[PDB]
Design a protein around this ligand. Structure first.
Ligand SMILES: [Mg+2]
Ligand SMILES: [Mg+2]
Length: 417
């Protein structure tokens, strides 16, 4: 469809003691789902959350992600609204608490998509009559200007904008506020209407976007497992994101991938994030068993966990009773090509062939550029089921090759005239 939003998901979360013998493949397969809109927008959603020695029977995913694809008056795709939310609190083993937190997480996301206003007006309408952080954006083609993207981040979500060669252009950074007693927690969408200092909480950027730009939104469950970087710290505020050099290396794979799906991009980041998460939790329980041998290298390992006077007994209780991981969600969007979307509309809506025919002349500089457009459309893949387990993904061609070839021949003939 044009509108897709993740549904309430309750999974069985095995303990670290059970996951400590499992490979990455098994860990991902039991914990993550693919929610697909098209080749150019996909969601991966799941939970890496685990107790050291106890299984979590009802592990409710408190993250939501959603998209509404928008069209011009002719029905040609020209924009989208995208939101990712992280419900604050929960994961304690109370279903009533998790249900309440999920309702706010989901409605926050849903309300953002259903609003038809610019981002600043949208945030005002959905923040007036349980907390959730939100990272969200609106892009739209403005005939004179091209694509303009409005970006909003409240809390510890993260948005990264790349070009078509996976060069990092912009980052809408995560935020933590100091709460006292050495603890930093993200602001919520709901906190925005309770204070005059909306800047201190709301990160806003308005950006010109190019065709084929990649926008990645992640909850801290995904990007927090990658190598992180402190961007800035004031008195009571921290600006945090991914190490840009490390994040760039994640795409080394796709360097020669002709037109990679949003799914493939999301999968690669999710795999690396959960690899580090799985190895992190392997190390912890083995270190715990290693420092139980003491009976009161490893030093740099023990140092790395704690620092990124407390009595030994308290630390061990902490490490042995600790939950690891979190609700982990990522959405990936490709900014559409003007020519590709006009061709999509021409094929899907052959009734509107007269109205669309005049628009091709402006969007076709050469036959080479037409061939480029039909090449991208040739490579588009869709998940016939909107949702399925990440390891049970089945993808088929968006178009019949024979349909694309006949349309290209017709359009090529008319260009050559
Ligand atoms: Mg949360
Ligand atoms: Mg989170």
């Amino acid at each position: 469809h044009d509108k897709i939003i993740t549904g309430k998901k309750i999974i069985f979360s095995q303990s670290v003691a059970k996951d400590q013998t499992k490979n990455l493949s098994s860990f991902l397969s039991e914990r993550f789902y693919s929610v697909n809109q098209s080749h150019n927008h996909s969601i991966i959603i799941g939970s890496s959350l685990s107790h050291q020695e106890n299984d979590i029977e009802h592990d409710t995913i408190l993250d939501t992600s959603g998209v509404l694809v928008t069209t011009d008056t002719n029905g040609i795709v020209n924009g989208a609204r995208v939101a990712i939310t992280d419900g604050l609190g929960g994961g304690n083993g109370d279903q009533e608490e998790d249900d309440e937190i999920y309702r706010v997480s989901h409605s926050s996301c849903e309300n953002f998509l259903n609003c038809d206003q610019n981002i600043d007006t949208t945030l005002s309408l959905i923040t007036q009559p349980t907390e959730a952080s939100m990272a969200a954006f609106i892009y739209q083609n403005h005939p004179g200007k091209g694509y303009i993207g409005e970006f909003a981040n409240i809390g510890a979500g993260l948005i990264i904008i790349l070009d078509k060669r996976f060069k990092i252009k912009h980052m809408v950074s995560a935020c933590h506020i100091y709460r006292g007693f050495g603890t930093w927690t993200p602001p919520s969408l709901q906190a925005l209407a309770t204070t005059a200092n909306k800047d201190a909480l709301l990160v806003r950027q308005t950006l010109k976007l190019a065709e084929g730009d990649i926008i990645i939104s992640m909850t801290d469950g995904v990007w927090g497992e990658l190598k992180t970087s402190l961007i800035a710290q004031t008195n009571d505020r921290r600006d945090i994101g991914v190490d840009k050099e490390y994040f760039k290396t994640l795409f080394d794979e796709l360097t020669d991938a002709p037109y990679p799906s949003s799914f493939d991009i999301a999968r690669i980041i999710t795999q690396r994030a959960m690899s580090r998460s799985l190895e992190r939790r392997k190390t912890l329980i083995k270190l715990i068993n290693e420092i139980e041998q003491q009976h009161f290298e490893t030093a740099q390992t023990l140092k790395a966990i704690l620092f990124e006077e407390i009595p030994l007994e308290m630390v061990m209780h902490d490490l042995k009773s600790r939950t690891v991981g979190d609700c982990s969600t990522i959405n990936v969007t490709r900014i559409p090509y003007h020519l590709d979307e006009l061709i999509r509309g021409f094929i899907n809506y052959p009734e509107k062939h007269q109205i669309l025919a005049p628009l091709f002349k402006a969007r076709v500089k050469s036959e080479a550029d037409l061939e480029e457009a039909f090449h991208r459309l040739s490579l588009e893949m869709v998940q016939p089921e909107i949702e399925c387990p990440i390891s049970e993904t089945h993808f088929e061609r968006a178009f019949k090759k024979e349909t694309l070839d006949k349309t290209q021949a017709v359009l090529t003939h008319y260009f050559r005239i």
